[PDB]
Amino acid sequence: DTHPLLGVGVTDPTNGTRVWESELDPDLLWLADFVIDDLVVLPGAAYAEIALAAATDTFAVEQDQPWMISELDLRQMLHVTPGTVLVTTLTGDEQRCQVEIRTRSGSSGWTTHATATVARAEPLATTADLEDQLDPDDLYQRLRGAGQQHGPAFQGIVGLAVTQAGVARAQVRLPASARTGSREFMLHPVMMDIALQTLGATRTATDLAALVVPVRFAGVHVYGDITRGVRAVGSLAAAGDRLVGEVVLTDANGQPLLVVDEVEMAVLG
Amino acid sequence: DTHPLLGVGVTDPTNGTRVWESELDPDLLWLADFVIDDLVVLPGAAYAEIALAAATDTFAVEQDQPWMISELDLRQMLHVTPGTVLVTTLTGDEQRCQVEIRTRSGSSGWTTHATATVARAEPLATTADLEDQLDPDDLYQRLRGAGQQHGPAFQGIVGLAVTQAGVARAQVRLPASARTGSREFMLHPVMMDIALQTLGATRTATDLAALVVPVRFAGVHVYGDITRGVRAVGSLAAAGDRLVGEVVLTDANGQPLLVVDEVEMAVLG
């Protein structure tokens, strides 16, 4: 009925700006399973869902996945505490619009956690690279001792390996404790996170370990219900000092469900 | 809990503007008793309540009647139909703010019905003029055959007379079918209307009769719960072609509860 993360919306008449508000609570759905330094945090994947959910609620469209996310900047983490209120704005047209996502302090104070640009979706267009099998329980234990406390709902990497070139290949499910409310989302945050987790298994990321979290997306393309995905493939390079990656999520028939052109990564104390 | 006319509010973060929305329905409270040309209409008094209710919901204040209404312009009538959505904006500070009240067409179309300026309240500062007693049932029958179909809830003028100078003096109650929800209001719309009805008994107004409705208020001062009022005194002059009046509502001890410095009146087809 109502989106659990975005909430209900009203268009301000003074300007074309549409404004949403929703109440977040750690006992909400599966938010409790995402934890950094013992703090329940809203995962960066979730801002993508909110942006897309916002665009779909403003404009009449006839499709299933009509939007791509041009850009998405993660400004500062959202410590999910009880009585957290999430305020979201949208401004633009059916071709291109900007979304801003915030926490609310009282009634007239806001802290913006992320900004996204949504636009009309673009339609989808044996070698010396052998795999070395890896234990998923090794990964979820490395970053569990580095701050990232992924719970049951976020432990979707069930098979993992990495090529000679350094690319990470993972087999992924959406865990049983995360398919409640799944139908509410266009781009299931938990699943997108699971796709993004693979980047932490690349040779680039592992040659560091502190943990390494996302801070920017560009070119998030959704071509279907990403929960139907089963194999995620992520590569992480380094250009400048910025860690820039790319991941691809494909269903059982190797069809792309989610494609993320860029993912800028960074370290966290 | 929630104001039946103003509704629930959210502050848009892009600008300081606060935005309310509420659902109006003719079977709402006593809206059905106010009728013009067989159409349920929101009475002009109600926009005053909405403006004050809006100001009180934006700002922290310690009083009972902290606001006066500097001005209030009635732009076009609101035909109350089922599923009517009333959108209200507020912009300013605790000293002076502007309110705009609208109907909503869909999700991105509005029709503004009234605009008001609210400001900090200013604190309260035998002759040849004999009365001629009048029948209240004569008044409510004159304007009932001219378009104004006041129902049970709006028939508060229970005693009426008019001086030699042309001033109208009325004894007023708040009818039994209108004290449901009374506690929700700061400035009970039905009562304010009843105060304003007196102007239709002045020598100026009667020397016309079509009916004569308000279109502008200035200097609406509220000094208490106006339902405690019992005697309303209204005078209507004519300067230029505009019909400009003034009414005063006083409680049992002759203490002013409501004072309206100006009321511009006009005819309606």
PDB file of C-alpha atoms in Angstrom, chain A residues 8-19 21 58 87-89 91 100 102 104 107-108 110, chain B residues 8-19 21 58 87-89 91 100 102 104 107-108 110:
ATOM      1  CA  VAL A   8       3.547   9.163   1.885  1.00  0.00           C
ATOM      2  CA  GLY A   9       3.922  12.247  -0.307  1.00  0.00           C
ATOM      3  CA  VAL A  10       2.455  15.685  -0.894  1.00  0.00           C
ATOM      4  CA  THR A  11       3.272  18.217  -3.590  1.00  0.00           C
ATOM      5  CA  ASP A  12       4.030  21.653  -2.167  1.00  0.00           C
ATOM      6  CA  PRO A  13       2.013  24.142  -4.229  1.00  0.00           C
ATOM      7  CA  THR A  14       4.489  27.048  -3.883  1.00  0.00           C
ATOM      8  CA  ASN A  15       7.028  25.172  -6.040  1.00  0.00           C
ATOM      9  CA  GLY A  16       6.717  21.952  -8.042  1.00  0.00           C
ATOM     10  CA  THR A  17       8.637  20.145  -5.286  1.00  0.00           C
ATOM     11  CA  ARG A  18       7.125  16.927  -3.938  1.00  0.00           C
ATOM     12  CA  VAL A  19       7.883  15.991  -0.331  1.00  0.00           C
ATOM     13  CA  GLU A  21       8.064  11.601   5.042  1.00  0.00           C
ATOM     14  CA  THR A  58       5.416  11.503  -9.051  1.00  0.00           C
ATOM     15  CA  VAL A  87      12.240  13.330   4.563  1.00  0.00           C
ATOM     16  CA  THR A  88      12.579  13.045   0.788  1.00  0.00           C
ATOM     17  CA  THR A  89      12.192  15.642  -1.975  1.00  0.00           C
ATOM     18  CA  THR A  91      12.099  18.161  -8.364  1.00  0.00           C
ATOM     19  CA  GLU A 100      17.260  14.560  -1.996  1.00  0.00           C
ATOM     20  CA  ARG A 102      17.212  13.563   4.695  1.00  0.00           C
ATOM     21  CA  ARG A 104      14.458  15.439  10.218  1.00  0.00           C
ATOM     22  CA  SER A 107      10.063  20.300  12.471  1.00  0.00           C
ATOM     23  CA  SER A 108      12.401  22.709  10.622  1.00  0.00           C
ATOM     24  CA  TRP A 110      17.192  18.534   8.221  1.00  0.00           C
TER      25      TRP A 110
ATOM     26  CA  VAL B   8      -1.791  17.223   8.896  1.00  0.00           C
ATOM     27  CA  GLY B   9       1.327  19.182   7.950  1.00  0.00           C
ATOM     28  CA  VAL B  10       4.863  18.729   6.679  1.00  0.00           C
ATOM     29  CA  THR B  11       7.590  21.312   6.193  1.00  0.00           C
ATOM     30  CA  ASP B  12       9.115  21.172   2.720  1.00  0.00           C
ATOM     31  CA  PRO B  13      12.894  21.226   3.200  1.00  0.00           C
ATOM     32  CA  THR B  14      13.688  23.040  -0.083  1.00  0.00           C
ATOM     33  CA  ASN B  15      12.058  26.227   1.258  1.00  0.00           C
ATOM     34  CA  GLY B  16      10.743  27.102   4.719  1.00  0.00           C
ATOM     35  CA  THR B  17       7.197  26.562   3.424  1.00  0.00           C
ATOM     36  CA  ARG B  18       4.921  24.312   5.478  1.00  0.00           C
ATOM     37  CA  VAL B  19       2.193  22.404   3.640  1.00  0.00           C
ATOM     38  CA  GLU B  21      -3.634  18.645   3.337  1.00  0.00           C
ATOM     39  CA  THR B  58       4.087  26.065  12.874  1.00  0.00           C
ATOM     40  CA  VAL B  87      -4.158  22.186   0.537  1.00  0.00           C
ATOM     41  CA  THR B  88      -2.792  24.934   2.780  1.00  0.00           C
ATOM     42  CA  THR B  89       0.599  26.673   2.845  1.00  0.00           C
ATOM     43  CA  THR B  91       5.464  31.041   4.949  1.00  0.00           C
ATOM     44  CA  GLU B 100      -2.657  30.371   1.238  1.00  0.00           C
ATOM     45  CA  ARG B 102      -6.463  25.805  -1.991  1.00  0.00           C
ATOM     46  CA  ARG B 104      -6.282  20.213  -5.203  1.00  0.00           C
ATOM     47  CA  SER B 107      -1.580  15.796  -7.732  1.00  0.00           C
ATOM     48  CA  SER B 108      -0.074  18.935  -9.335  1.00  0.00           C
ATOM     49  CA  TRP B 110      -4.391  23.794  -7.359  1.00  0.00           C
TER      50      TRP B 110
END
